[PDB]
Amino acid sequence: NKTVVVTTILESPYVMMKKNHEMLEGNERYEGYCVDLAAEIAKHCGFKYKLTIVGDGKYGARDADTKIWNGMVGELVYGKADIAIAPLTITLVREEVIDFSKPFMSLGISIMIKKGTPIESAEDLSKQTEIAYGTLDSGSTKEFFRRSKIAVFDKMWTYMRSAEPSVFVRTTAEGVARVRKSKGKYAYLLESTMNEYIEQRKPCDTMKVGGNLDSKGYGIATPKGSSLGNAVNLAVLKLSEQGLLDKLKNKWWYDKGECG
């Protein structure tokens, strides 16, 4: 009976540092959707755990030259952590090297603009140059554009891969800050979950425009063949059926909304 090392990532409102965190220790420093979900998963599977924030601050991508994985994915693949409880997107390239539970949350890539920016769709972003746009580094959104053979998205990638200065950001907070200070000349492509949360926070100057560009899910990840996987998957399905996932989403998005 070992303490399970949980890798996760600081990403609002999934895992955030509490306001008084420097006077707090271990798991108690953090709050958020995935902090509550970790507690619930651990209860139903019956383990003790330690939240650890991923060292390199990344979700996970595979370097094309070395084939080495970074981020939470790489922590699971190289045996640093036992489980990933995070907004980690289920993808085919990841599923090849790690296991995922059934999804605990739905999402899709979406567009974030500063309010009043004259963009309504991906198609709109793609037909112009005045408004720059990009995605997070080392995540599933960047890859979706990398891999897309849909004309509008292919054309969006061609611009993004070569744009100068770089349109890509290391963190969601960086991308969001860029939107907010670019006076409508930078739009950010990010997952609808993160977009809708931000929209409901002060200074209330961003919005999600248009529909989602895809539809997919976050799952709880474990190293390939790990013994936790079966229990974690049953636990996710249980929490889904009890209504707890829905309770948590409302708690962290809509109950803590501050743009009325």
Ligand X SMILES: N[C@@H](CCC(=O)O)C(=O)O
Kindly state the tokens that stand for 258.
């501050």
Q: Compare residues 27 and 148 and give the one whose CB is closer to its own copies.
A: 148
Q: Is 215 near its own copies (CB under 8 A)?
A: yes
Name which of 158 and 242 has its Cβ closer to ligand 1ND. 242
Q: Does residue 215 bind ligand 1ND (CB under 6 A)?
A: yes
191 known member of a binding site: yes
The burial class, CB within 10 Å (0-12 / 13-18 / 19+), for 130 is: exposed
Tokens found for residue 205: 């100057």
Residues preceding chain discontinuities in the chain with C to N over 2.5 Å: none
| Residue 52, strand partner residues | 7
Return the closest-CA partner of residue 122 out of 51, 59, 189.
189
Closer residue to ligand X in complex, CB, 8/140: 140
Return the residue of 28, 63, 95, 174 that touches its own copies, per CB under 8 A: 95
104 binds, among Zn ion, its own copies, ligand 1ND, none (CB under 5 to 8 A by kind): ligand 1ND
132 binds, among ligand X, Zn ion, its own copies, none (CB under 5 to 8 A by kind): none
Q: Is 245 helix (H, G, I), strand (E, B) or coil?
A: helix
Return the exposure string of 66-104: e unless at least 16 CB atoms fall within 10 Å of the residue's CB, then b: eeebbbbbbbbbeeebbbbbbbbbbbeebeebbbbbebb
* Binder among 14, 104, 133, 188 for ligand 1ND (CB under 6 A): 104
Give residue number: closest CB to Zn ion: 63
Of the two residues 88 and 98, which places its CB atom closer to ligand X in the complex? 88
The answer to whether 197 touches 12, Cβ cutoff 8 Å, is: yes
Listed ranges 70-78, 98-106, 120-128, 130-138: which one lies at the site for ligand 1ND (CB under 6 A): 98-106
- Chain residues that interact with its own copies, rule: CB under 8 A: 90-92, 95-96, 100, 102-103, 106, 144, 147-150, 214-217, 219, 233-234, 237-238, 240-243, 245-246
